[PDB]
Design a protein around this ligand. Structure first.
Ligand SMILES: O=c1cc(C(F)(F)F)c2c(-c3cccc(C(F)(F)F)c3)n[nH]c2[nH]1
Length: 334
């Protein structure tokens, strides 16, 4: 056990081992607090997230467990992964705080949209796909892909954060409609919204609520055709969709006027209404538009990921304790 030490950071008390010096705040919400820090052990500058109220309820105890499990598993250069996880507690008894350490990045991909040429787009969307491809392959849906959770370095290396746990502007139509069985291509939808915005400077679907959000989607990709109408289970949804004014599928080359044609082509493939026909992350990597970056032996997939716990209803002391085992078994990466 290393030697810890204490300090007050704004509202919160922080108790981090001595290897992290010069804590400084960076942002905080109901995620927890994040500080910037120096890691003496590795020379790296890191982000340290102190979780807010890790075990208030059954749903926070599960959230905490899930998030430790996700971070422990992600090892890929376009996806955040865990440098360290630690607590001040020295037994299960006194365990009430969990800290996660990851590579610092602070800028997010919005902090760029308000500053975006063609090759900059290519490199940025190719990286997101290369990380979705890894993510999807362990059988995980990000579910909330959006500019603010895509972090970029000063040399424009990109990493996905906040995966698996979950702004309406980037959600697929099927989620707006509440479909309970959506597949991984909801993430590819959002990628489609994000590349649009980068090439043009504008939000593609700045819906002002969820009905609006959908009006604006169907305006570009058209109302459902019969092949798709026939796969909708839900009475009420079928009825919703089918009761709007019929809208034709727009020509993307008009709407994206003078974008690279290759880029317009990819969009047209990401933004298919029918989620069964949307391109996949692995197939999009092979698309013409990443001609300059695509390499099939440098686009790895993930180890299997045991998500069997998502269907367990456990006590608050049980997730707490499963988390604890996970903090303990943590083997730092090389
Ligand atoms: O019970 C359901 C409910 C839905 C729900 F998405 F519509 F809600 C669906 C969908 C589905 C998929 C993609 C896009 C759409 C669209 F946005 F075009 F309407 C619907 N496929 N199958 C369903 N079965």
């Amino acid at each position: 056990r290393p030697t810890f030490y204490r300090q007050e950071l704004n509202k919160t008390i922080w108790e981090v081992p001595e290897r992290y010096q010069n804590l400084s705040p960076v942002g905080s919400g109901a995620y927890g607090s994040v500080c910037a820090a120096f890691d003496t052990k590795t020379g790296l500058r890191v982000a340290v997230k102190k979780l807010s109220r890790p075990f208030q309820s059954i749903i926070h105890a599960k959230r905490t467990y899930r998030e430790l499990r996700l971070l422990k598993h992600m090892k890929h250069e376009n996806v955040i992964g865990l440098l360290d996880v630690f607590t001040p507690a020295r037994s299960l008894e006194e365990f009430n705080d969990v800290y996660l350490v990851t590579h610092l990045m602070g800028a997010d991909l919005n902090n760029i949209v308000k500053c975006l040429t063609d090759d900059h787009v290519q490199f940025l969307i190719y990286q997101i796909l290369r990380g979705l491809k890894y993510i999807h392959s362990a059988d995980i849906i990000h579910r909330d892909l959006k500019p603010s959770n895509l972090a970029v370095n000063e040399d424009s290396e990109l990493k996905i954060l906040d995966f698996g746990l979950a702004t309406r502007w980037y959600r697929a139509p099927e989620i707006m409609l509440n479909w309970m069985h959506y597949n991984q291509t909801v993430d590819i939808w959002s990628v489609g919204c994000i590349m649009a915005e980068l090439l043009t400077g504008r939000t593609l679907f700045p819906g002002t609520d969820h009905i609006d959000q959908l009006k604006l989607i169907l305006r570009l990709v058209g109302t459902p055709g019969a092949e798709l109408l026939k796969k909708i289970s839900s009475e009420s949804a079928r009825n919703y969709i089918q009761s709007l004014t019929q809208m034709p599928k727009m020509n993307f080359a008009n709407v994206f006027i003078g974008a690279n044609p290759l880029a317009v082509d990819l969009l047209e493939k990401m933004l298919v209404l029918d989620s069964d026909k949307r391109i996949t992350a692995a197939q999009a990597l092979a698309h013409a538009y990443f001609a300059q970056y695509h390499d099939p032996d440098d686009e790895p997939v993930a180890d299997p990921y045991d998500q069997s716990f998502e269907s367990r209803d456990l006590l608050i002391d049980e997730w707490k304790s499963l988390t604890y085992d996970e903090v303990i078994s943590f083997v730092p990466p090389p």
